[PDB]
């Protein structure tokens, strides 16, 4: 399945940016993002350790739009690997095909990139892949189907990716709308406020 | 279930209005669906103002263990119209004091 519905409620509940709109105008002037959603928005209501762990895990899940069972799978495979499962989890989550397409800049949001992937418009190594979970390997050359390169959405999102901060680990050729995924980003490159140790503590229980 | 509830309501109201009745409980097993309804219709007006007959369980086919122990539970007379009992039903009937009878004409059932 997939979460469909209001997307500014999640930002208000988590209390942070949690990029879910196109980012065109702003985030503050659409949802007054300083109250928790619902009737009792003004109450502060500090929360326990379990609440903090749950909020962190839910925040990560709500940013990539992954449900609970697939998150369990990702966590299990990350723990099975070597080298600090906490950062292996983000290493794994950054290699998803929809996330890669979003980073390359062919989609306004994660959901838009997911629909680009699902609707048979993205080819990974020169053949169509429509699974928004395909782990992109380093060196793969993602592209767009020639019959769909003149869609207004990709061109519109190209400049938005132009001004959002350089990722500096993928490359893109704009004329042919074709890019290369050099390598999965290091833990430093990602936002150093997602404290994954809370996730590890929550699941190891 | 709705019909059972409504019939229970009507029976409770009638019993409250009149008094009490003595019920003869019957388990009835026939061979064909057509005979069962005729037997049930004939066994409706046979009662009186103090004693009535109630079919606690019907069915089509031979007499089994389930209806035998249902008759045991309800203290009911077991009737088989053109049907027989298998080994389990026979065992249950012989072990206890259940009385079960065979008929091929409905008027024998009416007289009994």
């Amino acid at each position: 399945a997939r979460y469909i519905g209001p997307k500014c409620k999640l930002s208000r509940r988590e209390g942070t940016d949690l990029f879910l709109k196109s980012g065109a105008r702003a985030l503050d002037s659409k949802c007054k993002a300083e109250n928790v959603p619902g009737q009792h928005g003004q109450r502060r209501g500090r929360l326990s350790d379990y609440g903090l762990q749950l909020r962190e895990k839910q925040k990560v899940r709500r940013i990539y739009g992954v449900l609970e069972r697939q998150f369990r799978g990702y966590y299990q495979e990350a723990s099975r690997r070597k080298g600090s499962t906490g950062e292996n989890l983000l290493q794994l989550l950054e290699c998803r095909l929809d996330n890669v397409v979003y980073r390359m800049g062919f989609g306004s949001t994660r959901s838009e990139s997911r629909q680009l992937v699902s609707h048979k418009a993205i080819t990974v190594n020169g053949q169509t892949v429509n699974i928004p979970s395909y782990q992109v390997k380093a060196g793969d050359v993602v592209a767009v189907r020639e019959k769909s390169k003149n869609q207004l959405r990709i061109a519109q999102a190209l400049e938005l990716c132009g001004q959002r901060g350089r990722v500096e680990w993928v490359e893109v050729d704009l004329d042919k709308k074709a890019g290369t995924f050099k390598s999965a980003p290091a833990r430093s490159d990602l936002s150093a406020d997602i404290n994954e140790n809370l996730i590890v503590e929550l699941y190891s229980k | 279930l709705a019909r059972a509830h409504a019939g229970k309501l009507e029976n409770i109201f009638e019993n409250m209005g009149q008094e009490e009745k003595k019920t003869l409980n019957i388990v009835l097993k026939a061979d064909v669906r057509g005979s069962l309804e005729a037997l049930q219709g004939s066994l409706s007006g046979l009662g009186n103002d103090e004693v009535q007959v109630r079919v606690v369980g019907g069915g089509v086919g031979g007499i089994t263990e389930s209806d035998a122990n249902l008759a045991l539970a309800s203290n009911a007379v077991l009737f088989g119209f053109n049907v027989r009992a298998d080994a389990g039903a026979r065992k249950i009937v012989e072990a206890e004091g259940l009385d079960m009878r065979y008929y091929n004409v409905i008027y024998d059932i009416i007289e009994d």
Binding site: - | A4, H5, K8
Partner: protein, 61 residues
Amino acid sequence: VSSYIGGEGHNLQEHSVVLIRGGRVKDLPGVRYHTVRGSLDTSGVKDRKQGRSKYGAKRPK
């Protein structure tokens, strides 16, 4: 055995075929089982709209 009937109303009478499940009622001494609503002859509660899966109630629609 003895079973407990949940919900506000019920239609059980003599010789009613019922299904029972586990679960002890703390207040009643000797009651160790629960009657499943809406399975064989219990029909479940009516006019119930919150959590109406433990009481065998269809979706109001």
